[PDB]
């Protein structure tokens, strides 16, 4: 008669994330109560919800109105809840206790991750002249967790090089194109395409390049 | 509508401990489950029991047949338990959980305190002859928490020296009459006297003392 539960929850940014509690208990047993903690490392811990077997749900005043039992029928010996609208905030561990009889108590961990994609920016190098050697293009920038995939797509010949900066609960990865300017390569798209896990299309934005002859 | 508890609990060795926890609610509420844990500190923490409002009380595996609730009637809204046959194990603090409807969940914590009374024992100096100068007449040893208190109730003249010496969880006292020898002192009583808190009556015990002539 044991505890089923998620290792690890994972939910893209702004997406509900239902986190699971079932105690998996045979013919003889019931649950009495079952609290939804935070597990915060330093910062207290964050008491969620607690649901009991009469009084219902009671929601914890930080969480108030973003916490909510699964639409029924619910077995009542589930204790699962569903955290509305989930934000970068809520990355972390979360520890779900429950209070069975006549088994006794029992916890149970889980984490949970939340993605969040992108919203990538290009901007263009300097003004690109038929005359100079390797030079800018443009700079192509996406913040996201995890860290998103940049790259271009392009018809023209050039190197590009990039730098991926891990940040508080992020990471923003820039990538830049270079090239030799030539006039031929003037009105063609060079094209920015960046992917992440919590996009399911993966995003591309497109710059025109430009180059003038030698003057 | 607060929550109700002693800040710190006080037994002799071999008492029930009650311990306090009753949640002084207003007219329109209710308590769902209270738990009772150890505040063990790097030593996990040891759950004591847990009581629900359906489903009874539910004691730990490690304090299997020494909790119990008090006998009733009970206020409904009482989580008070009694911990039976308390042992110099017990010493330490405690917190008492509860979840209120439609208050919230609240805690409180209380330190316990187990007095244990010494057994004390006295030890006989050398054999005590009339030729001698300053010798031991007696040693006298008790060791408690807290620290017992130590003298020496007699008729003869001497001086005492003492130790104290703290141990892990309680006081070993020494303490040893000095005298020099004397015929007029035979036959003549030295008691050693013992106090501690835990102790109602003063705890006494008498050594005749001895001195046979120089010889």
Known sequence: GELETSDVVTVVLGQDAKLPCFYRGDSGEQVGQVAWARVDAGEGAQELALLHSKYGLHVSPAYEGRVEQPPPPRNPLDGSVL???????????????????????????????????????????????????LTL??????????????????????????????????????????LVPSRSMNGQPLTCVVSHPGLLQDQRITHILHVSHHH
């Open 137 to 178: 293009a443009a700079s192509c920038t996406a913040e996201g967790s995890p860290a998103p995939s940049v790259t271009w797509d392009t018809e023209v010949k050039g190197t590009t090089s990039s730098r991926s900066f891990k940040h508080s609960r992020s990471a923003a990865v820039t990538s830049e194109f270079h």
């Open 83 to 133: 955290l509305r609208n989930a934000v970068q905030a809520d990355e972390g561990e979360y520890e779900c206790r429950v209070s069975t009889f006549p088994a006794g108590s029992f916890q149970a961990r889980l984490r949970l991750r939340v993605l969040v994609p992108p919203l990538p920016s290009l901007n263009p190098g300097p003004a690109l002249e038929e005359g100079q050697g």
